[PDB]
Symmetry: C3
Subunit: 146 residues, 3 copies
């Protein structure tokens, strides 16, 4: 399996209130690299008229590569090729030697494994107060766990 994504026609992400955003994250594995693209669109509430000037999204995983409860609707986190939920995706996780847990690591950033157990992505975007939250798509690349 090469691809995990969160494609959804309907809102699948909850930042300030339930299902107020659409998150499209796509990971494709090529050996030890994953290529990621991420697009987040604010749809309801304060995400249409921002008060803060930055927003973060954390996707936590267990030590086997399963998505844990978080802002993303887990039923939308699927292997694209089979359309099964993206369970046990250890070889898509950020490598814990290259990115040890809790190591230090419009603007965008991604930090890997800022979590006490398992794995994580922490995304951060700047935001413009008074405007809808809808940052440009970002592309990133990281080394995976074996």
């Amino acid at each position: 399996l090469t691809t995990i994504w969160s494609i959804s026609p309907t809102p699948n992400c909850s930042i300030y209130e339930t299902q107020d955003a659409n998150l499209f994250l796509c990971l494709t594995k090529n050996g030890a690299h994953v290529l990621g693209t991420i697009t987040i669109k604010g749809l309801k509430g304060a995400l249409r008229e921002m008060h803060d000037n930055a927003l973060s999204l954390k996707l936590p995983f267990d030590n086997q590569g399963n998505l844990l409860n978080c802002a993303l609707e887990s039923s939308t986190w699927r292997y694209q090729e089979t359309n099964a939920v993206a369970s046990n995706a250890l070889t898509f996780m950020p490598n814990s030697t290259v990115y040890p847990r809790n190591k230090t690591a419009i603007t965008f950033s991604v930090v890997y494994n800022e979590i006490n157990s398992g794995y994580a992505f922490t995304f951060k975007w700047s935001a413009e107060p008074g405007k809808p939250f809808h940052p440009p798509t970002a592309v990133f690349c990281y080394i995976t766990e074996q």
Copy 2:
């Protein structure tokens, strides 16, 4: 098949006059992502001494992923691995859900599916008047049709 490219030792692109440029576009598919690199070199005519300060190149495709008549010599648009023409390359086309047709979406840009039928890439570069057109190589990444 992983790779489509337009490699050519001789001019294979017509911007202002016949065969006045060399276009090297290389697409490699990794699951739902394509990684693209594009290099265009002006060789003859106004491309050696630009009058305008921007230039675009559109590559249109039918709904099956075949390149339609355009500035690129179609005989150079080939699957690298077999050296056959890159016919029916649907799974290299920009995804029409992620990039709906006609949706809004040195400088470089790529816009996907700005076309009424099928698929497209529209590339745009800035140019420096009075100088040859030969922008730096650009790398881009997009989500493919399934």
Copy 3:
């Protein structure tokens, strides 16, 4: 084989003195493209308190894709999947038609095939005098030899 890397827990690179740095270079091949990430960390000597404001690293290869004697410890240059040394990696070499030998092609740059025989990567980073050498990770993409 998809992946070559230089992962090492201990110093594996010699810039000013023996084993004064850690080089982590990871190449993954997807058809005609390689995606590369490179991280270099200065560990000893002047690399902890720079005098110059730029540093280069050249990785030379023979015409068969074997790493030749250079600043990187060759025993750490391995196919990730088999953990064998990365011998005869011709299809990871920068394409000699796209990047002809000796053709012209914090800051980072990579130049391909600046060498009289075989293949090469030449990396260059800026550095801040008085500070340790530890530039941000860089990601790059190139076309491979067939």
